[PDB]
Amino acid sequence: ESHPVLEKLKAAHSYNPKEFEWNLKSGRVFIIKSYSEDDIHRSIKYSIWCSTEHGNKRLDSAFRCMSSKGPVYLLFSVNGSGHFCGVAEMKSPVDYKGKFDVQWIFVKDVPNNQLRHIRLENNDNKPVTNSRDTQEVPLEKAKQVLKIISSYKHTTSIFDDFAHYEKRQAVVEVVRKERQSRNK
Ligand SMILES: CCN(CC)CCNC(=O)c1ccccc1S
Structure with missing residues (x-):
């Protein structure tokens, strides 16, 4: 029983490409810390991200x-996960x-012990x-890091809970509309 949103995304994008060039000629790479799974779910389905103002x-x-010298990649982790x-x-x-705008490439859980x-010499090692x-x-x-993430044989990903996040999103919208309505 797959969710039609996820089946549409999987048919339109090649997630977890078996051929990915981890040995970058150029590019810059940043860590993204998300406040929740729900934000990751929205980012994947709508291909967008928002950080803080800084x-x-x-x-x-x-x-x-x-300036298209090369890519900017973002490595996502939810706080505390x-x-x-x-x-x-x-x-x-x-x-x-x-x-x-973001283009999701890998969607897969890679545990921190991998x-x-x-260590990051530019952040006190x-x-x-x-x-x-x-x-x-x-x-x-x-x-x-990209070599490890790319080759890791993952057992799960947020896609395994996709229908759960879809339902949470739909319920929250209705809860908010009703609350807004009672406030009239
Ligand atoms: C309450 C935290 N969260 C719930 C989904 C809302 C704030 N998060 C966003 O609105 C957002 C999420 C993903 C990608 C872009 C944006 S802008």
């Missing part, structure tokens, strides 16, 4: 500075409440699994 300025500057949940490529500058040994939102990963360590 986070949006950092990402906007990197995208415009990259203990795994990374995928990778998207940033696909537009920030549009202003800033949003920007990436913990990789802490593990990449201990980053804040829009932490930049140096190029050579980004290749190592």
Whole structure:
């Protein structure tokens, strides 16, 4: 019993491509910390992201500075989750409440213990699994992370709970409309 939104997305995009070039000639790579699974679900279905106001300025500057020299990749993790949940490529500058276009590439859970040994010299040598939102990963360590994420034989992903997130979204909209209506 697959959800029609997810079947449409899977037919229109090649998630988790078996051929992905982790050994980047160029590009910049940033950590994205999401506040919830629900935000990841929206990002995948609508191909957009919003960071904080400071986070949006950092990402906007990197995208415009990259000027299509190469990609800007985003490594997603929800706060407190203990795994990374995928990778998207940033696909537009920030549009202003800033949003920007993203293209999701990997959708798969990679547990933190697979990436913990990789430390970020530009962030007091802490593990990449201990980053804040829009932490930049140096190029050579980004290749190592992308190599691990790309080849990891995942057992699950947010797609396994897709219908649950769809139902939560639809219920929340109705709850809000009714509340707004009682406020009249
Ligand atoms: C309450 C947190 N959250 C629930 C879905 C709403 C705020 N989050 C967004 O509105 C958003 C989510 C994904 C991609 C872009 C945006 S702008």
